[PDB]
Amino acid sequence: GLFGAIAGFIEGGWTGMVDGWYGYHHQNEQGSGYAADLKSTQNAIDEITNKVNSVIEKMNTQFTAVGKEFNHLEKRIENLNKKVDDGFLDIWTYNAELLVLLENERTLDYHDSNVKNLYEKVRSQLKNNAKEIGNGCFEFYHKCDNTCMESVKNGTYDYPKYSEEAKLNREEI
Amino acid sequence: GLFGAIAGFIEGGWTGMVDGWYGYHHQNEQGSGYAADLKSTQNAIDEITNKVNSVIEKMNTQFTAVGKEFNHLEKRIENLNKKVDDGFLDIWTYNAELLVLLENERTLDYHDSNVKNLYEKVRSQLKNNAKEIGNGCFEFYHKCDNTCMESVKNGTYDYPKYSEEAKLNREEI
Amino acid sequence: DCNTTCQTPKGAINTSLPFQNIHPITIGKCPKYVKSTKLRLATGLRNIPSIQSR
């Protein structure tokens, strides 16, 4: 079906990229392939493990023994006790819910924010050498063997090098 | 050590830029120098002062005198009173914690979000005139005295002007 | 002879902050008692003078 254009440029996921969360894919004169950015993947796993633990471990816990007995003649108290309980129920239920809700919100943005940072890092290297074409795919104006490629992903991309060649293909038919 | 590539493009801070939070640096034919974006710095200070005050002043405060005495024979009540207290402790502790936690989260993104907005504003002015090269540094394809420079930071940058010159250096050796 | 807004068996405290871990028993218009040990609220940037031995 149709979809707002405000929806993340990279439309689909990759059952293909099994090794990690974020990562790349290449089509060059040597074959296809996927690749997981381990260092970023570990990073995010470290952070999320922390949010999970925070949400869990930050919660205090006194030894409590809820529960009280009264008789047919201490009903006012019993109702005071009732509301202290219902009172706490309505509180925790509400915070337990909005907490997971809002934290689930932020966590799926983290991830979004995270790939968009990867795609940024790349479009910043491959200045003119490449065409940005959508769903976060760059096409090359120049051959790009498994050096060039393990290189763009190494953060170590040579721009002058392949620039000369690419200069001419931003011309031809 | 190593680090996920999802980590902010601008890696380090500047003990050098003392005047404010966000800001610039220049190397041109006249000397080095740092410069603080006061207007943005004041802006953020205004906002953060507000978050700080919100978190503090929004908190209600009835005159209360916690504390009750009972005798060897009103122990059920005393335990009701005990749990009302422990109950409130476990609540505030939890919210006091997740509040600062999640608010600390958002505040360091605000700041991140904020410089990235500065770097955006700039890469949008210096279209072709400059090379984007990482850690948020642009190099010029043309001389850029203290006019040109106080100008890119004034939001008032002349693109046609220096364009002609730069056109040729995106050519030479 | 001092004044306070919040008394505790251990001493008086201030009320210009939201939370407090001095004491559960309180008389006055008091900060909420918490079992936390620090509640630092970041205001500024991530201090990163060096990216050394990272």
Epitope: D19, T41, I45, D46, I56 | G1 | -
Partner: antibody, heavy 129, light 112 residues
């Protein structure tokens, strides 16, 4: 405080099977990854397998992939190694060990483990015809 | 699989001398300022005890003579007030990747 006891060691004919147990005491078992480590008689230390706290992640040394099955029971606070079709190369003393990291998410085969904070007194397993 | 090699295999020290055990690693085991690397101390006939973790941090209750160093790819355990209740084999272990690997170990002979 912390206590880890291994059992079920002994001498087995090659090709056959063995099941090691390890009872834990002194900490919250159901929130830590757990490892099995071994040491050939006189040789170095070989990491062998890790099972995540919830138990939906099990990872093995190349050299036992296929034949060993790590498992747990938080109900009983014990950790198991079930070795199958044992070679003599498998003869070793087997140390039950604790990951330092609380609730580590082992979503991936390669991610990092904590360190090994507490060890078992170790039980030896001899494979031999 | 990252490979933890260490030098030397044995080492002799007269009850009181220094004791520096090197520990190189196939590749950098430092990520976000942390040094994913521990040392374990096995007394001949015993399970290994944790000694230093995160490259340089005495555990539990470990005597001050013990000192860990290094970053990236090369590390170093350092014994010092070389007492003799402390002759045993020393393992460096990386845990930055699974599988976590070990060193082959260093044996510790009281040189006379």
């Amino acid at each position: 405080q912390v206590q880890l006891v291994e059992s079920g060691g002994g001498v087995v004919q090659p090709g056959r099977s063995l099941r090691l147990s390890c009872a834990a005491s002194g900490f919250t078992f159901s929130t830590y990854a757990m490892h099995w480590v071994r040491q050939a008689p006189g040789k170095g230390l070989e990491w062998v397998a890790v099972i995540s706290y919830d138990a939906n992640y099990k990872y093995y040394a190349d050299s036992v992939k296929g034949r060993f099955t790590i498992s747990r029971d938080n109900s009983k606070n014990t950790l198991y190694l079930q070795m199958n079709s044992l070679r003599a190369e498998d003869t070793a003393v087997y140390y039950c060990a604790k990951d330092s990291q609380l609730r580590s998410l082992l979503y991936f085969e390669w991610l990092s483990q904590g360190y090994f904070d507490y060890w078992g007194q170790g039980t030896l397993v001899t494979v031999s015809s | 699989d990252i490979v933890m090699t260490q030098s030397p295999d044995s080492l002799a020290v007269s009850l009181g001398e220094r004791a520096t055990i090197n520990c190189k690693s196939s590749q950098s085991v430092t990520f976000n300022y942390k040094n994913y690397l521990a040392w374990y101390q096995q007394k001949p006939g015993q399970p290994p005890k944790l000694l230093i973790y995160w490259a340089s941090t005495r555990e539990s209750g470990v005597p001050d003579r013990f000192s860990g160093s290094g970053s990236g790819t090369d590390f170093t355990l350092t014994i010092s007030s070389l007492q003799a209740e402390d002759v045993a084999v020393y393992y460096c272990q990386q845990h930055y990747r699974t599988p976590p690997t070990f060193g082959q170990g260093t044996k510790v002979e009281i040189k006379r």
